Design an enzyme around this catalytic site. Sequence first.
Site, PDB file in Angstrom:
ATOM      1  N   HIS A   4       0.799  -1.217   0.000  1.00  0.00           N
ATOM      2  CA  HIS A   4       0.000   0.000   0.000  1.00  0.00           C
ATOM      3  C   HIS A   4       0.836   1.274   0.000  1.00  0.00           C
ATOM      4  CE1 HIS A   4       0.296  -0.598   4.493  1.00  0.00           C
ATOM      5  NE2 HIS A   4       0.337   0.722   4.499  1.00  0.00           N
TER       6      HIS A   4
ATOM      7  N   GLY B  48       3.660   5.858  10.206  1.00  0.00           N
ATOM      8  CA  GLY B  48       4.994   5.703   9.655  1.00  0.00           C
ATOM      9  C   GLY B  48       5.674   4.399  10.016  1.00  0.00           C
TER      10      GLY B  48
ATOM     11  N   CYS C   9       4.472   1.319   9.374  1.00  0.00           N
ATOM     12  CA  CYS C   9       4.254   0.240   8.416  1.00  0.00           C
ATOM     13  C   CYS C   9       5.566  -0.226   7.796  1.00  0.00           C
ATOM     14  CB  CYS C   9       3.288   0.676   7.305  1.00  0.00           C
ATOM     15  SG  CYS C   9       1.613   0.669   7.926  1.00  0.00           S
TER      16      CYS C   9
END
Lengths: 300, 298
Positions: A40, A142, A144
């Site tokens: 993503h 942030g 991920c």
Amino acid sequence: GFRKMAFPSGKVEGCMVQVTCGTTTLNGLWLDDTVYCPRHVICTAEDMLNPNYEDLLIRKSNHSFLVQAGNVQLRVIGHSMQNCLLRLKVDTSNPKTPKYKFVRIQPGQTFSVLACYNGSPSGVYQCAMRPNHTIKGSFLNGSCGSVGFNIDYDCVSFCYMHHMELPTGVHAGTDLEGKFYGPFVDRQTQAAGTDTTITLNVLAWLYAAVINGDRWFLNRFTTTLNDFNLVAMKYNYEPLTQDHVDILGPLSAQTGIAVLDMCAALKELLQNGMNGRTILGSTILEDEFTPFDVVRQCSG
Amino acid sequence: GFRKMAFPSGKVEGCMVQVTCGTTTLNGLWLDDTVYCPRHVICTAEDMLNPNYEDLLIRKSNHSFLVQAGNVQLRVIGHSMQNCLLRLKVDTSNPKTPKYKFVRIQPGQTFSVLACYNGSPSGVYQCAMRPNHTIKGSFLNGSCGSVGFNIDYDCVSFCYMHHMELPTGVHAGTDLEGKFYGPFVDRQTAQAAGTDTTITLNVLAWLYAAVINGDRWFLNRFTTTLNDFNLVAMKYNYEPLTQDHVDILGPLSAQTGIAVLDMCAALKELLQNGMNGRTILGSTILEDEFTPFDVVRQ
Ligand SMILES: *[C@](O)(C(=O)NCc1ccccc1)[C@H](C[C@@H]1CCNC1=O)NC(=O)[C@H](CC(C)C)NC(=O)OCc1ccccc1
Ligand SMILES: [Cl-]
Ligand SMILES: [Cl-]
């Protein structure tokens, strides 16, 4: 005493990079000449609800991706999707690549998380995969692409890559083949099932108590695994599996207490309660120390 | 979403070495061309009950110390003692040496511990320096010379080197100048600490944490004065709170809109009435090893 302790993070710190599409930066894992990150990263805000990831990726090229180790750009020379991850081929093999494997852990197992922001490691902590396939982590905007791992001798087993936070505040993500733990999907919509207590780890906690001389809860009786599991479910404990019984083998051998005999002790605790008495100093049973953790901190 | 978190340990792992003298092996810290380690590495079981360290060390040579960085031997070319530490000079500088400083931490402050065995890092966890100058760690045979540290930017501040496990199971050690925290001594005797107290500032920080993560059942409509709070706190073996501590809690007070003394009123109530079996951030008890910084940092 007994601490939640993480594995030393250095070998994983040496693998962390940042991956940016437009203004969207998350973390990636650089092993040999591949960088892994959540797919993503390629989404805009308006794609998040129901992204068409295949079409989003067709619009991308190698030179759409900014991969950096620190402030140093790593050139991307190929890109593809593997389930919910991107695999970015890069033109430099990471010289700090450790001995590693990719493992898909089971619910109840623990791992260390290196929380990272913009490719920069921030903190390291231990967590357990809950029976409902979430972790109770500590992740901010942030994070991920941060990974979970265990270390066996010199070998890093990567088991988790972080993707999302559910409405209840728990976290969900994938293994390093991009397959989610649990039923979740990487779209900005989702509820975890009701959680249960990790019976394996409570049993480990009881074995730890015995090893340290705290054994008032042992009894002279035993149970079958089926009778135990049927009672456990009535108290929102996970049923035991054959793997759980095997994993308890070393502790059972160390104490001489058969696994099913400890199950009978635990059954009596569930049915009668603690009645104020304590175990390892607490009225509450701990369920995020695994048998491996107990052996590591009792024996080394 | 709020856990005890250690600093990433990589900058410290690259400094850990194994030190052997005689039959004793423990860990050392290799910074530039110096290796630091507990001086009791030179002791024999007999020496241990009243070791005259200067007398035992003058009887050693450079060649008595075997220092290994992984598979590689480092040759010791000099040695000195600084309080309870040895400083071994070696012929090789460590290229993995981070920017660093040596700090003496204060009671109530937290640091990360890198537990090591045979010079090999094993685990990392967060610890507080207790008011009675012990730490509640996880250390086994072989852990001596493991270090505690904090990281500020890319600067590692070393604050702890591990030496001892007291009979009660808590731990004692030195700063990196070799001075013990607390009244402890590196002789092989059973030592007791002074009575410990609860770190009030950290409990308050953790209550502000619980309010940031949605939990606020323990709040009440009341306030208290600083002094009336401290009277009750001292009765329950909690540290009194200074105005400096109240100032430190400002940002957490600003973020949550809960005045520090209002949170003190909530804690007073918890001290006098207990938790009724409820929990805060999952805990049955009031946690006191999160600092205000730790809470803000996460
Ligand atoms: C530390 O010296 C160490 O790890 N040494 C290496 C080593 C290798 C093989 C076997 C033993 C030790 C050690 C750390 C302790 C051991 C268990 N957990 C720990 O944290 N520290 C010590 O052994 C102390 C040495 C003195 C000289 C500083 N001794 C100690 O802790 O004694 C406590 C005690 C309690 C009751 C009675 C007498 C002593
Ligand atoms: Cl003494
Ligand atoms: Cl009172």
